[PDB]
Amino acid sequence: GPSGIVPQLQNIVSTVNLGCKLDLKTIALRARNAEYNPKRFAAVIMRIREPRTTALIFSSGKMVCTGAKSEEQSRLAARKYARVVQKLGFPAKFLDFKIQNMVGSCDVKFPIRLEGLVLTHQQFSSYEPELFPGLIYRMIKPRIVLLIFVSGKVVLTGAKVRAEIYEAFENIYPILKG
Amino acid sequence: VSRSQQRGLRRVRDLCRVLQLPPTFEDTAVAYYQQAYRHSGIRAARLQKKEVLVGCCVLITCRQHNWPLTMGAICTLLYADLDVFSSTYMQIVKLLGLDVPSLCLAELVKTYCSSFKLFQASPSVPAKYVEDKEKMLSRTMQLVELANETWLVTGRHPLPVITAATFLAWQSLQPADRLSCSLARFCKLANVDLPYPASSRLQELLAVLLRMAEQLAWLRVLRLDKRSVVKHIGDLLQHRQSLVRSAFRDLLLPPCMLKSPKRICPVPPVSTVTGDENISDSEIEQYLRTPQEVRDFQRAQA
DNA sequence: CTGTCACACCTATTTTAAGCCCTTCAA
DNA sequence: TTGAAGGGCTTAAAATAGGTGTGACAG
Ligand SMILES: [Mg+2]
């Protein structure tokens, strides 16, 4: 008996190794979409318009890609940053691409007594309203962290694959309902 | 034997003595600080974290004995950043594997309400503003329990709820002479800081009492407002359990649910991306500076 | 009294949630 | 006076990494 609610993917974090050392001053000077403030942060901040994402490019050749709404979009965006870096004169490669984190969200559309949930599911729950309005639920199977709000809105994070977000939500729904 | 541990254990004891805690609390808090220091993650932490850890260990001890110490009050006494206190507290509870009891609202109502200097007349507290301490505590507690039953406490800071409830209890005990006094003027004469969310909590509590008033025919006919409802608070609290059940029976929800009109759902676009599509040279070239753009930038940095 | 060692943990990127808390501005 | 509105923080995840805080080791 499924809930009939499908969590929406909000953000994907992926990594890739461009397999060569990079001169960040050269990238900042010769790219249009690069932001570089070494005294503030040691990496280049690069942005492309489609898929709309942000990349962090390190002098080691390692790269982090953020903001995509699908694992496919994250891969296409990562390949585009690699192609920008290649055109800038570097012998960049596309090695060890990996989805590292996925964030999902949904609404159960009924209020939640967080003060009651933290008592019945204490071993997984942390609720400190002097610090944060949501209850932090650390699910073991799958290993997902959920942020549960009084509104019934739920944030799911820490997933490596899409199925882990869906599995964690189907697990929490009967706990929240009854 | 560590110099920062010795300093920490001494600070733990000094905090307990300043707080005038029962004698047993000191030992328990000292043992938590020692337990904390055995973990490598705490041993290698910044001296600022080791300073707020003093407060975390005393707060955990107070929470287990229902002693109503707030995180805000500890940080004020320790001259500590609340955010550093927040991250250290969450870390040490998780690290020591503790099931820390929640803040005891009933005991906070007693301690916080008693600090309101309204029990004796003075140049700043006129005769008509002086109230009985027992009458004050009893009505404040009933208004805090109402706020808790009507979803005004869940996910919020608890102290501004008690500030709003103490003010409303005080006004409702002599409505004819106290309705001209605002929340800000009240906290100033009672000599208590005004918490920023306390005005929002007040307006929510007045709207809840107005929905309850709709359940009594003789009050529904008066077409009450947030000002005229105050003289009937005594009457509404007399039947709070019954009026709350009747209001839910006929939509009573957390304020963040009713409602969010400014929301956009058409922003997400349909996705047909495979991640394997060709990437043309023209698609990439638009992200490159031209030779002129490079020269103009270089000259401007020289 | 230094060097090594193994942690912490600042800067930053993304995204949702609800609350807080500040500046800014309006009749 | 008293609010609304808007910006920027709190919480969770995850990788990327230099510089440096912090204390217990060997030598
Ligand atoms: Mg983090």
Numbering used by the authors:
A (entry chain B): 157 to 334
B (entry chain A): 65 to 314, 356 to 407
What are the paper's exact sentences on this?
TFIIB-related factor 2 (Brf2) is a member of the family of TFIIB-like core transcription factors. We have solved crystal structures of a human Brf2-TBP complex bound to natural promoters, obtaining a detailed view of the molecular interactions occurring at Brf2-dependent Pol III promoters and highlighting the general structural and functional conservation of human Pol II and Pol III pre-initiation complexes.
We obtained X-ray crystallographic structures of Brf2-TBP complexes bound to the U6 snRNA (copy number 2, U6-2), RPPH1, and TRNAU1 promoters at resolutions of 1.9 Å, 2.2 Å, and 2.7 Å, respectively. Where not stated otherwise, we focus on the analysis of the complex solved at the highest resolution, the Brf2-TBP/U6-2 complex (hereafter referred to as the Brf2-TBP/DNA complex), but the conclusions apply to all three complexes. The overall architecture of the Brf2-TBP/DNA complex is reminiscent of the TFIIB-TBP/DNA complex (Nikolov et al., 1995, Tsai and Sigler, 2000), thus providing experimental support to the proposed common architectural organization of TFIIB-related factors and TFIIB. The highly conserved dyad K113 and K114 contacts the phosphate backbone of the DNA on opposite sides, allowing the insertion of a short helix into the minor groove and the consequent direct recognition of bases A+3 and G′+4 (numbering is relative to the edge of the TATA box, with the non-template strand designated by a prime). The side chain of R110 forms a direct hydrogen bond with A+3 and a water-mediated hydrogen bond with G′+4, whereas the main chain carbonyl oxygen of A108 forms a direct hydrogen bond with G′+4. Brf2 residue Y260 establishes a hydrogen bond and a T-shaped π-π interaction with nucleobase C−4 and an additional T-shaped π-π interaction with nucleobase C−3. At the tip of the molecular pin, the Brf2 residue C361 is buried in the groove between two adjacent phosphate groups of the DNA backbone, establishing both van der Waals and water-mediated hydrogen bonds at the upstream edge of the TATA box.
